[PDB]
């Protein structure tokens, strides 16, 4: 029953001369924005990507993101000289908020280096993570010198974001609570035996993401059923592959059961072998 806005940044430094910064924004599971290194502006991926925000308010953020990108790139380069870090460098940012029922909202600004958390924005200021190397202290020292940036991050996290997500939640209402029914079929995977059979229950085309899939003999669950990762389709629906490695033969009298919200408890049942 909740929908965090996640603004995601990937920045890559191959050498002192070659870099790229790309980004995107997710409202829950849906990608609302895209932002490529070679683009002047952030891109709106849905007709409702702007929320209740005006053109001028959106342009304000546009200019901020514009200055942020070039300044970030250079700050990392100069940090690299300072901290004697070898290229290539991998920096990621997860920033954003979520509006909670009633009033409250939590927000976050986490940054990672070569895949690990190094620091975050806590309240007013940049804070290293518990198990971050010592050089991270040196960066915190210098980052925490910049008063305007610390205030700007505060404004975005505490003010802009929660206001923005409120407009998005309203503006994408229908698309966010939309239901698309799944379709399921059975198949026979490569034999893990002999004399063992590999049974596969495929479920594809469902929206939204949360789902329940399991192999069963009657009303009993088959502990040993390995569900897969819930995989993305290009049309923003989802796919799933539940396997079962069973001996013989029997069963035989075995059934894959799919539960989604589409789909008001009228589960899709498929019996082996009807494929």
């Amino acid at each position, epitope marked *: 029953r909740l929908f965090p806005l996640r603004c995601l940044q990937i920045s890559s430094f191959a050498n002192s001369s070659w870099t790229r910064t790309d980004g995107l924004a997710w409202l829950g599971e849906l990608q609302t924005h895209s932002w490529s290194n070679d683009s002047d502006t952030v891109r709106s991926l849905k007709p409702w990507s702007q929320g209740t925000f005006s053109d001028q308010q959106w342009e304000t953020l546009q200019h901020i993101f514009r200055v942020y990108r070039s300044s970030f790139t250079r700050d990392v380069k100069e940090f690299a000289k*300072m901290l004697r870090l070898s290229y290539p460098l991998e920096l990621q940012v997860s920033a954003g908020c979520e509006v909670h029922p009633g009033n409250a909202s939590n927000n976050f600004f986490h940054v990672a280096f070569q895949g690990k958390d190094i620091l975050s924005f806590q309240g007013t200021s940049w804070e290293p993570t518990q198990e971050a190397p010592l050089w991270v202290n040196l960066a915190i*020292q*210098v980052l925490n*010198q910049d*008063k305007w940036t610390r205030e700007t991050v505060q404004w975005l996290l505490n003010g802009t974001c929660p206001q923005f997500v409120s407009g998005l939640l309203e503006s994408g209402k229908s698309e966010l609570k939309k239901q698309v029914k799944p379709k399921a079929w059975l198949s026979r995977g490569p034999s893990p035996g002999p004399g063992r059979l590999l049974l596969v229950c495929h479920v594809s085309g469902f929206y939204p993401k949360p789902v329940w899939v399991k192999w069963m003999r009657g009303e009993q669950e088959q502990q040993g059923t390995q569900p897969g990762d819930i995989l993305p389709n290009a049309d923003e629906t989802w796919y799933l592959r539940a396997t079962l490695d069973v001996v013989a033969g029997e069963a035989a009298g075995l059934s894959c059961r799919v539960k989604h919200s589409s789909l008001e408890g009228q589960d899709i049942v498929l019996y082996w072998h009807h494929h």
Partner: T-cell receptor
Amino acid sequence: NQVEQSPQSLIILEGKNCTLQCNYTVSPFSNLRWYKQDTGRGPVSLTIMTFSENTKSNGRYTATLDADTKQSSLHITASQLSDSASYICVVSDRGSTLGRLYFGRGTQLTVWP
Amino acid sequence: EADIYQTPRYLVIGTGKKITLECSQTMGHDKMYWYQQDPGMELHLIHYSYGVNSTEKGDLSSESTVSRIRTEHFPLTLESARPSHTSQYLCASSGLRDRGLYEQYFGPGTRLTVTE
């Protein structure tokens, strides 16, 4: 250079007011500083201003800023002989120590009696 | 201004010989700078530092070297004096001041003349 000062040099009589200009293309913009440097000495800081400030004073030195036209000037009130120095415009692109300082060439002011 | 020192104030030395210019500060500012200035001309950044064992190269090319082995000392060296090194050399530090801005503090400078 991303900081230009005008004029290169000027000669004035004492007890006069004068205005020295500074234009910058630097971005992003954090703050601008004016330095007085007497020949054979380190620069001494006259003023520092941020984008939100249009004026600052230090005795007979008044620095103005217009952030829209990336333009500053230093107005010297009632010039005296000791004002004969090089005047230096310096812009910074970070509110921290991690940034560049862009130095103007300097404006050599001579004050004659 | 008063909390950053340079010795000597004036220096004369023969060509080929080694030269060391002392720059110190009683404050604990990490960020420090070396400038070169020929009379009349502008200030050229030749070296800068973010703290100990940090010795970055500046805008102007230079055969001088620096060392940052202590927070409070930023000695500059020329291993072989030559007449073209005749100039004024200005040390600087950056740190907080009267407001929330980091500002420069310039040392008095050293006048160097390399003679034959």
